[model samples]
Target: SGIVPQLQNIVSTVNLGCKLDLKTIALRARNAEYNPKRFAAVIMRIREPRTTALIFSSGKMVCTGAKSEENSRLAARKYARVVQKLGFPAKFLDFKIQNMVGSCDVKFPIRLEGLVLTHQQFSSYEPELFPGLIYRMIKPRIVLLIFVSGKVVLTGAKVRAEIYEAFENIYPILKGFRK
Candidate 1:
């Protein structure tokens, strides 16, 4: 069985009439003293291990190289705080950890069908090896599960709503299981 690690929230949204580049926000995050080491760690993680960056047409960007929800959240907060300190309006800052599911190696050829299970129904399908499996099912969406080994699986969720629902179902289960 897997352990449900503590989750973190990091989110940021840009404010109106203020323009800045993603690199600036990232730089601010790395320089914060309160969590200087964590900030630097996050920056390094983003640069090397997590090399993927999503840049929206609106000039907004979402950095997704964090290995854990905690790191992601810290990065988001640090980025926002640093940007604001640099004279950016707080209204434009947004940071949050939408949700994350971690699994060890999982078996191959797993399939997921959308428009099938609700949140509660999906969580009921938790496997023995992954008691921490949390499902948040939303209508009109699909989820694919790929287990690379006994402990790891890659979950591909198409819609944001689907991810939200799954985390909603998992938190309570994790809390009860922890106690």
Candidate 2:
């Protein structure tokens, strides 16, 4: 029952017609019999340009705008099993899928602060301040704020870590992006 580390990554500018069948992927992962104990958390997203937002705390998630809701739900159930085997208590998890219109953008920003800042410190301060910096400065399509305390917030993102490297690369140019 120890906390797990976060695995944050992103795939960006995915076109509307493309499909990343997460349900199939999850089933394959479980079927492959990978060790569940090694991971603390696993999250995935599909970003289409629109203002709508979806959050998945446990299980699986399908961010909408795809051709089928059935596929999304199926993906969630399948991935949930994989996530459960990874040691997360069933009661503590869930998944979601959202559909948006306009553009499609994705970015993943994996915050490594937890390795330095304890959960208590993170929750008390960093989380609240981080997003404003991202939105006002980087202006990414998606920004995922994850902390070691098992808390995750997704904003202005269609994919995870999509804008992380860019933000890191350009952080020196803008003072606000700095911690």
Candidate 3:
């Protein structure tokens, strides 16, 4: 089974190590927007990795929409540099990949009904309500949404390995209940 999971999104966060004034940042940066009444953080966008960054007043920045780990870190650093040039003592510190989302297809229909029945402890499926089987793996703590059409989605992992790890663990189980 060459069912390799490709990363669709990588969410990362970094600290600027200094408080920020959202109003000033929004006014100065052409790509930044702030709405204090609607949202507390200043919404920032970058084109290099085509990602969005949520800049909090507490100097914390959340970057999302990167397809790879390196891109995630690069996007965060780029956002930090934007702030650095804005005259704030912004330093990229404690950068961490918070979550990774990836998806793949098993190339065969999966028997959702049989899977839930056999793995009730970690699987949930209610075709009347939802078409996909929600399998919550406890080891790596990754949640997988398995569809009858063989499409699978993996989320809630801090690193890319966990996504691949979860998929590797589930592939055999999916084969066990192949339709």
Q: Give the winner by TM-score.
A: 3
> What C-alpha lDDT, on a 0 to 100 scale, does residue 30 get in candidate 2?
26
Alpha-carbon runs more than 4 Å astray in model 3: none
Candidate 1 C-alpha lDDT tens digits along 1-179? 23332222223233223454445555555531222343322231244323233433233445564566555545544444455576755433444444344333322222222212433465434455543333433442433232212232224343244445444443343333321
Model 2 Cα displacement at 153 (Å)? 28
Clashes per candidate (backbone, < 3 Å)? 26, 23, 0
In order of appearance, the predictions have TM-scores of 0.37, 0.23, 0.96
- Candidate 1, residue 108: the lDDT equals 27
Best first by lDDT, ranked: 3, 1, 2
Report, for every candidate in turn, its global Cα lDDT versus the true structure.
Answer: 0.39, 0.33, 0.94
Model 3, span 1-179: residue lDDT tens: 67789999999999999999999999999789999999999999999899999999999999999999999999999999999999999998999999999999999999998999999999989988889899999978999999999999999999888998999999999999889
Ranking by TM-score: 3, 1, 2
